[PDB]
Design an enzyme around this catalytic site. Structure first.
Site, PDB file in Angstrom:
ATOM      1  N   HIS A  92     -26.916  44.709 -18.868  1.00  0.00           N
ATOM      2  CA  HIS A  92     -26.326  46.024 -18.688  1.00  0.00           C
ATOM      3  C   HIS A  92     -24.991  46.044 -19.425  1.00  0.00           C
ATOM      4  CE1 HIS A  92     -28.433  45.972 -14.470  1.00  0.00           C
ATOM      5  NE2 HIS A  92     -29.305  46.061 -15.458  1.00  0.00           N
TER       6      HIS A  92
ATOM      7  N   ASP B 117     -26.949  55.404 -13.858  1.00  0.00           N
ATOM      8  CA  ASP B 117     -26.374  54.570 -12.803  1.00  0.00           C
ATOM      9  C   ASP B 117     -25.516  53.409 -13.335  1.00  0.00           C
ATOM     10  OD1 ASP B 117     -28.807  53.346 -13.731  1.00  0.00           O
ATOM     11  OD2 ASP B 117     -28.840  52.146 -11.883  1.00  0.00           O
ATOM     12  N   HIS B 118     -25.609  53.201 -14.646  1.00  0.00           N
ATOM     13  CA  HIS B 118     -24.897  52.185 -15.419  1.00  0.00           C
ATOM     14  C   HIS B 118     -25.580  52.240 -16.788  1.00  0.00           C
ATOM     15  CE1 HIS B 118     -28.196  49.273 -15.604  1.00  0.00           C
ATOM     16  NE2 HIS B 118     -28.472  49.693 -14.382  1.00  0.00           N
TER      17      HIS B 118
ATOM     18  N   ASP C  12     -26.064  34.099   5.247  1.00  0.00           N
ATOM     19  CA  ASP C  12     -27.186  33.173   5.347  1.00  0.00           C
ATOM     20  C   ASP C  12     -26.873  31.700   5.636  1.00  0.00           C
ATOM     21  OD1 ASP C  12     -26.473  32.541   2.707  1.00  0.00           O
ATOM     22  OD2 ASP C  12     -28.538  32.537   1.975  1.00  0.00           O
ATOM     23  N   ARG C  13     -26.278  30.971   4.690  1.00  0.00           N
ATOM     24  CA  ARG C  13     -25.986  29.568   4.989  1.00  0.00           C
ATOM     25  C   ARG C  13     -24.722  29.366   5.843  1.00  0.00           C
ATOM     26  NH1 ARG C  13     -28.756  27.430  -0.244  1.00  0.00           N
ATOM     27  NH2 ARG C  13     -29.019  25.816   1.357  1.00  0.00           N
TER      28      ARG C  13
ATOM     29  N   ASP D  80     -30.781  55.878 -16.160  1.00  0.00           N
ATOM     30  CA  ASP D  80     -30.920  54.453 -15.829  1.00  0.00           C
ATOM     31  C   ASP D  80     -30.927  53.514 -17.038  1.00  0.00           C
ATOM     32  OD1 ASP D  80     -31.547  51.803 -14.569  1.00  0.00           O
ATOM     33  OD2 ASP D  80     -32.064  52.912 -12.783  1.00  0.00           O
TER      34      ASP D  80
ATOM     35  N   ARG E 157     -22.516  23.216  -5.922  1.00  0.00           N
ATOM     36  CA  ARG E 157     -23.661  24.072  -6.247  1.00  0.00           C
ATOM     37  C   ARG E 157     -23.332  25.392  -6.970  1.00  0.00           C
ATOM     38  NH1 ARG E 157     -29.482  25.432  -4.343  1.00  0.00           N
ATOM     39  NH2 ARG E 157     -29.906  23.637  -2.968  1.00  0.00           N
ATOM     40  N   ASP E 158     -22.347  26.140  -6.475  1.00  0.00           N
ATOM     41  CA  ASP E 158     -21.898  27.381  -7.119  1.00  0.00           C
ATOM     42  C   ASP E 158     -20.896  27.083  -8.241  1.00  0.00           C
ATOM     43  OD1 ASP E 158     -21.694  28.993  -3.844  1.00  0.00           O
ATOM     44  OD2 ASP E 158     -23.441  28.674  -5.105  1.00  0.00           O
TER      45      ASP E 158
ATOM     46  N   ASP F 193     -33.358  51.148 -19.153  1.00  0.00           N
ATOM     47  CA  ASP F 193     -32.884  49.939 -18.505  1.00  0.00           C
ATOM     48  C   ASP F 193     -33.904  48.824 -18.674  1.00  0.00           C
ATOM     49  OD1 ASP F 193     -30.723  48.677 -16.770  1.00  0.00           O
ATOM     50  OD2 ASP F 193     -32.494  48.397 -15.469  1.00  0.00           O
TER      51      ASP F 193
ATOM     52  N   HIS G 159     -33.462  45.773 -21.656  1.00  0.00           N
ATOM     53  CA  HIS G 159     -33.252  44.362 -21.358  1.00  0.00           C
ATOM     54  C   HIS G 159     -33.881  43.484 -22.431  1.00  0.00           C
ATOM     55  CE1 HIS G 159     -30.954  44.403 -17.701  1.00  0.00           C
ATOM     56  NE2 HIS G 159     -31.762  45.299 -17.163  1.00  0.00           N
TER      57      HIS G 159
ATOM     58  N   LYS H 161     -38.221  51.188 -10.265  1.00  0.00           N
ATOM     59  CA  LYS H 161     -37.006  51.810  -9.731  1.00  0.00           C
ATOM     60  C   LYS H 161     -37.284  52.578  -8.454  1.00  0.00           C
ATOM     61  CE  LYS H 161     -34.640  50.317 -13.227  1.00  0.00           C
ATOM     62  NZ  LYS H 161     -33.607  49.262 -13.143  1.00  0.00           N
TER      63      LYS H 161
ATOM     64  N   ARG I 216     -20.769  35.156   3.170  1.00  0.00           N
ATOM     65  CA  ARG I 216     -22.198  35.320   2.985  1.00  0.00           C
ATOM     66  C   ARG I 216     -22.946  34.846   4.232  1.00  0.00           C
ATOM     67  NH1 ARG I 216     -26.475  34.862  -2.074  1.00  0.00           N
ATOM     68  NH2 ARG I 216     -27.933  33.568  -0.879  1.00  0.00           N
TER      69      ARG I 216
ATOM     70  N   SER J 233     -28.700  48.271 -10.981  1.00  0.00           N
ATOM     71  CA  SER J 233     -29.430  49.393 -10.383  1.00  0.00           C
ATOM     72  C   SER J 233     -29.150  49.564  -8.900  1.00  0.00           C
ATOM     73  CB  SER J 233     -30.931  49.254 -10.615  1.00  0.00           C
ATOM     74  OG  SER J 233     -31.190  48.902 -11.950  1.00  0.00           O
TER      75      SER J 233
HETATM   76 MN   LIG Z   1     -30.095  50.774 -13.118  1.00  0.00          MN
HETATM   77 MN   LIG Z   2     -31.435  46.363 -15.025  1.00  0.00          MN
END
Ligand SMILES: [Mn+2]
Ligand SMILES: [Mn+2]
Length: 508
Positions: free
Chosen positions: A460, A442-443, A261-262, A10, A151-152, A401, A405, A334, A259, A60
């Site tokens: 990551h 996992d990355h 939700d909205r 991880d 917004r986005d 992981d 960070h 995790k 998406r 993750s």
């Molecule tokens: Mn991970």
């Molecule tokens: Mn992470």
């Protein structure tokens, strides 16, 4: 009882370059000993190999969803993107049936969804492909309801998008702006039905402020301090003051948003039939081919173009079926990863599943305790192994992981070597019971702690992930992805691989 342990390091990726590499600069005699004595390979944990856009680093949550699933688990935006790229988008039965009705009913097709390149709730390129499809299929009338973003993307950019849309209308021959509404009107998600009513009344009754074009609307809307996200539901009208298009009986609609939700609220008002949340008057258009790109909720009535991945037979489920006993374990950071996400977004425990949780240290950003909880997790795991009680083990070591960070090198080296020490402990214990370890990640993350110019690298990485099998005489593939891992565990376990696992075993 010979334990088959899947071991997720991880945030531990494989990078040839040594500058800024906490993994390479860390002394790892246990990991290096296993790499050199057992069959090893690398696996791509990134981009579309794990259902993400190309280039993009993994995380993750898709990593573990991918690892548990034994298949590529596509995310919404990449799912459709691949369908447009590979030309499967247009064979899509749900679009085709909805285009059909229009032709034989002599009606209009409506396009609506968030008009922008944001990639969060929608992408305009998706609507473009919809314009191309209608145009190719020969539909006489196609209307666009701009839901404006702001917004986005940048807050004053709808025009750059209206322009891009007009270009696609020129090249395609079909397409016509009929309504513009800001997302705050059309993309409410808090049950504010007076705002949703307003947007609706523009689409079906033709009611609101009137403009000769969409650019005129946005020009005038801007002039009164009202921008993209807040722009009143407005009507585009022909040379005369008549509405360009209203949504009428037997018109087809395709809500390209992906998406849930909205999107829910405006979908409900068109689809439900017996809605009653506000009064829609008397001109309720119904009998419709309402399409959603994806499934928004049980609360919606129409059709879905890209139905959800039902994600039935994941690793958890299949081992449970074979009557095998299984163990998920990690510390808090995790824990949802070896449980929920590894199980295919599934809360509940499978038969024969046991889950153990080691509390994560009472600590802030985890670089002050580069060791976190590994040793407690390690201890409890050797206990369970000692106790012969599980056929399959799912372990995540979270340290690289979470410490990685930090974008700090010396704390992250400590974390790789703490992880190093514990993996020897876990793997000695496993081998002691004549079992097999799959050592993976996992990355990546810890492998790139500094950037180009020695600035903190807190994300990551894109890097490949290691893959060891502590079984002497096996050949391993070189391609390898995360959806391939579950299938190779079933190879070790001798249980049959089900139809839904489209991944391939790594053992040649
Ligand atoms: Mn991970
Ligand atoms: Mn992470």
């Amino acid at each position: 009882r010979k334990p088959t342990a899947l071991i997720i390091l991880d945030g531990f990726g494989l990078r040839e370059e040594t500058y800024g590499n906490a993994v390479a600069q860390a002394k790892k005699p246990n990991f290096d000993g296993y790499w050199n004595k057992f069959p090893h390979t690398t696996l791509t944990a990134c981009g579309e190999a794990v259902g993400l856009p190309e280039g993009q680093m993994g995380n993750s949550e898709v990593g573990h969803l991918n690892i548990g699933a034994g298949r590529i688990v596509y995310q919404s935006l990449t799912r459709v993107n691949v369908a447009i790229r590979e030309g499967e988008f247009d064979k899509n039965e749900t679009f085709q049936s909805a285009i059909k009705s229009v032709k034989e009913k002599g009606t209009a097709l409506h396009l609506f969804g968030l008009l922008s390149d944001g990639g969060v709730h929608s992408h305009m390129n998706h609507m473009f492909a919809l314009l191309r499809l209608a145009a190719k299929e020969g539909v006489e009338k196609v209307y666009i309801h701009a839901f404006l973003d702001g917004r986005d993307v940048g807050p004053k950019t709808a025009q750059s998008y209206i322009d891009a849309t007009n270009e696609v209308i020129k090249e395609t021959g079909v397409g016509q702006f009929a309504t513009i509404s800001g997302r705050y009107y059309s993309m409410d998600r808090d049950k504010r039905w007076d705002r949703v009513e307003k947007c609706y009344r523009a689409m079906v009754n033709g009611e609101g402020p009137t403009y000769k074009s969409a650019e005129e609307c946005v020009e005038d809307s801007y002039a009164n301090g009202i921008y993209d996200e807040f722009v009143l539901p407005s009507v585009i009208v022909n040379e005369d003051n008549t509405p360009v298009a209203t949504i009428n009986d037997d018109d087809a609609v395709i809500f390209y948003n992906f998406r849930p939700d909205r999107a829910i609220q405006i979908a409900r008002v068109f689809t439900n039939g017996d809605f009653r949340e506000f009064d829609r008057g008397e001109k309720v258009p119904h009998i419709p081919e309402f399409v959603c790109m994806t499934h928004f909720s049980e609360t919606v009535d129409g059709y879905v173009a890209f139905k959800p991945m039902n994600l039935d037979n994941t690793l958890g489920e299949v081992v449970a079926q074979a009557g095998l006993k299984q163990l998920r374990i990690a510390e808090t950071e995790k824990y949802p990863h070896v449980t929920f996400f590894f199980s295919g977004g599934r809360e509940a425990e499978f038969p024969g599943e046991e889950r153990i949780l080691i509390n994560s240290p009472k600590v802030a950003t985890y670089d002050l305790k580069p060791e976190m909880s590994i040793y407690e997790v390690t201890d409890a795991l050797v206990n369970e192994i000692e106790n012969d009680k599980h056929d399959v083990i799912i372990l995540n070591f979270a340290n690289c992981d979470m410490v990685g960070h930090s974008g700090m090198m010396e704390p992250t080296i400590k974390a790789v070597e703490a992880t190093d020490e514990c993996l020897g402990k876990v793997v000695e214990a496993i081998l002691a019971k004549d079992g097999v370890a799959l050592i993976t990640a996992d990355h990546g993350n810890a492998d790139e702690e500094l950037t180009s110019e020695g600035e903190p690298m807190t994300a990551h990485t894109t890097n490949p992930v290691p893959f060891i099998v502590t079984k002497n005489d096996v050949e391993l593939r070189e391609d390898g992805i995360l959806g391939d891992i579950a299938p190779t565990m079933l190879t070790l376990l001798g249980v049959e691989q089900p139809k839904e696992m489209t991944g391939k075993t790594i053992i040649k």
